[PDB]
Amino acid sequence: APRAWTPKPSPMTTPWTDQVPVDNPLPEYPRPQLTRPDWANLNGIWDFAVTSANAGQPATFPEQIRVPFVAESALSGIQRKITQNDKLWYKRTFTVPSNWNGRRVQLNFGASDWRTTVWVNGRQAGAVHSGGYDAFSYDVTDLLTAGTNTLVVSVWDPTETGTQAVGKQRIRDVAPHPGGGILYTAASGIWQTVWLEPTAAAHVTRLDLVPDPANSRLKVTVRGAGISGHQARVTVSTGGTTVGTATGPVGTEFTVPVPNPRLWTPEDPFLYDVRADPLSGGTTVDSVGSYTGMRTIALASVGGHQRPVLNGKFVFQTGTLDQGYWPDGIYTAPTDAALRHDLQKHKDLGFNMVRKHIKVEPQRWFYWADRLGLLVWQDMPNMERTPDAAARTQWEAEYDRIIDQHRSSPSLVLWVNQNEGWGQYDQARLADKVKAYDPTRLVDNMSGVNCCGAVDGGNGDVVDHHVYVGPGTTVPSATRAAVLGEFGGLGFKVAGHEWYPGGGFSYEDQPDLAHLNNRFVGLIDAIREVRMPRGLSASVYTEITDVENEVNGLLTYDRQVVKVDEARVRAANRALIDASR
Numbered sequence: 343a344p345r346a347w348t349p350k351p352s353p354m355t356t357p358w359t360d361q362v363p364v365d366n367p368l369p370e371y372p373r374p375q376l377t378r379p380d381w382a383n384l385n386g387i388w389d390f391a392v393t394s395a396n397a398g399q400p401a402t403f404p405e406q407i408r409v410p411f412v413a414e415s416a417l418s419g420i421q422r423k424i425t426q427n428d429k430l431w432y433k434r435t436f437t438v439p440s441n442w443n444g445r446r447v448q449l450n451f452g453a454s455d456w457r458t459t460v461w462v463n464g465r466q467a468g469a470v471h472s473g474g475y476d477a478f479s480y481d482v483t484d485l486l487t488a489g490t491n492t493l494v495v496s497v498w499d500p501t502e503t504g505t506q507a508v509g510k511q512r513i514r515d516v517a518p519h520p521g522g523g524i525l526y527t528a529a530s531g532i533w534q535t536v537w538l539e540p541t542a543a544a545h546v547t548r549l550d551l552v553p554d555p556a557n558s559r560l561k562v563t564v565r566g567a568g569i570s571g572h573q574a575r576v577t578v579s580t581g582g583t584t585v586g587t588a589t590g591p592v593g594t595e596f597t598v599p600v601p602n603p604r605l606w607t608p609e610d611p612f613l614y615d616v617r618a619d620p621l622s623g624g625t626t627v628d629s630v631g632s633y634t635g636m637r638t639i640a641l642a643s644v645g646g647h648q649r650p651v652l653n654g655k656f657v658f659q660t661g662t663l664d665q666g667y668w669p670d671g672i673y674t675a676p677t678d679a680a681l682r683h684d685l686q687k688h689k690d691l692g693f694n695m696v697r698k699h700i701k702v703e704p705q706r707w708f709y710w711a712d713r714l715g716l717l718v719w720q721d722m723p724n725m726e727r728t729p730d731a732a733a734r735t736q737w738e739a740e741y742d743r744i745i746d747q748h749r750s751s752p753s754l755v756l757w758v759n760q761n762e763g764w765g766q767y768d769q770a771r772l773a774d775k776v777k778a779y780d781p782t783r784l785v786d787n788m789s790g791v792n793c794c795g796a797v798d799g800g801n802g803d804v805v806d807h808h809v810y811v812g813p814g815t816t817v818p819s820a821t822r823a824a825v826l827g828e829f830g831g832l833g834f835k836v837a838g839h840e841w842y843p844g845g846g847f848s849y850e851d852q853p854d855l856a857h858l859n860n861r862f863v864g865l866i867d868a869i870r871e872v873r874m875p876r877g878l879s880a881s882v883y884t885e886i887t888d889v890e891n892e893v894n895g896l897l898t899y900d901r902q903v904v905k906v907d908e909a910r911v912r913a914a915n916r917a918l919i920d921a922s923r
């Protein structure tokens with residue numbers, strides 16, 4: 343028997359640290375934009391081991407871990423530093439619901455950092471998966487028994503010693519300490535829900551729902567496994583009202599009417615239900631639920647300046663930098679309420695945008711931005727240094743998968759390919775590649791071309807400066823809108839709510855909360871009165887929460903304290919948005 347699972351005191355307590363279930367944490371459906379009623383959540387207490395990197399499966403698993411929290415986190419019950427010379431081993435038993443008899447069974451991982459190998463009942467389930475930010479799945483039907491099944495997963499993660507996408511993760515001793523700067527605790531292992539679902543053999547794996555409200559229609563591509571010879575019926579509805587339906591070919595775009603569309607905006611994030619049914623004749627072979635928000639994003643020349651236009655109209659995108667870090671969970675928010683809290687706070691403070699910083703969150707995060715009405719800018723997580731040929735192939739493969747996994751999100755409107763030159767290469771080529779791969783989103787070739795040795799490819803849709811404290815003097819070009827991809831960074835150490843007392847740093851330390859509030863609102867007023875009329879179209883305020891010793895959140899790292907006067911910040915942001923309109 344392994345050492346029984348043991349909770350670990352968290353470095354800071356969030357409102358939800360003590361709210362995490364033991365046996366079924368993160369219970370919510372993990373893929374809310376492609377749904378079926380039948381599923382089973384495999385989160386909870388697994389047996390666990392740490393071996394050397396090249397070890398095979400251990401004969402004994404001596405410990406237990408709480409999936410899906412990384413080994414570095416307190417919530418995992420392990421809370422240990424994991425190096426490139428280590429490998430994580432997970433094992434649990436599971437039963438298949440008997441009502442799934444006669445269906446295929448898919449085993450789904452939302453994410454696992456970095457290189458994951460999976461065995462079901464001793465048999466490798468499929469190819470090793472490399473990449474810490476993209477979901478992956480195996481068809482495990484043929485490997486199952488009617489009895490107790492065993493699932494074993496190995497996960498190797500070299501963090502920054504590897505050539506792979508890592509973002510802010512660095513190999514760090516886990517106990518709070520000073521002097522880590524803007525890089526934080528690493529995240530190794532399974533960090534998003536693991537689950538099972540039954541499917542017909544021929545089944546939908548992906549929906550690409552592309553709003554075309556100007557043409558009162560939804561562009562749909564139904565994709566999947568074994569269905570390429572079929573038609574598909576796609577229906578758009580709201581409540582009990584059918585809005586439109588069409589039958590078209592699987593794997594090729596076709597349109598479904600959406601007459602008199604109600605548009606998705608941050609102010610009114612209206613969502614329509616969507617159902618997709620691959621058909622043989624009139625026989626439904628599979629059926630998935632989904633949704634869409636009817637919105638477009640593009641560039642246009644407005645009042646003499648290139649501007650990003652939402653549904654054909656310019657609105658200023660006033661956002662925060664959001665790094666997705668948790669003191670208790672590291673990469674994984676302790677509960678769904680915790681995950682969405684950070685986005686709710688954006689809304690409370692009058693922001694209409696979020697830049698998710700060199701991290702891709704789970705699908706439920708995109709669902710929350712979709713529902714709450716925030717524009718999303720998505721960074722591709724960077725590599726730690728210049729890639730060699732294999733590293734480039736791998737990074738591009740990851741990015742392709744991340745793009746393909748988010749095509750239907752209304753919130754997502756912009757891709758940030760690279761950040762401040764980190765691991766930079768092929769700046770112009772990657773901008774064109776991403777735009778061609780997802781032309782209904784904006785593309786940012788490089789964030790912070792004004793600084794840091796970052797090379798501007800010269801293309802993509804935006805010229806993106808990082809200016810601290812800011813807001814600087816970025817102006818659009820004839821071809822590109824001007825954005826402030828980072829600014830602000832105002833620090834304040836809140837006693838009782840410091841990850842490491844006295845450890846905090848920022849781009850400008852404030853002596854008290856009155857100073858922080860005045861200085862913050864002065865930045866937003868500057869943008870409203872001077873920079874936006876001169877061509878600035880978006881700004882990203884660093885940052886939504888403190889992270890480790892970077893104490894420039896609007897919120898403390900534990901989410902316990904809102905440092906700013908919410909009514910004042912909301913009023914400044916709303917004034918900016920209103921003025922832009």
Ligand SMILES: OC[C@@H](O)[C@@H]1NC[C@H](O)[C@H]1O
Nearest residue numbers: 524761762828831884892
């Ligand atoms: O750590 C957050 C922010 O202050 C950092 N500014 C420079 C980098 O682009 C960002 O990571």
Ligand SMILES: [Mg+2]
Nearest residue numbers: 455499529530
């Ligand atoms: Mg990692």
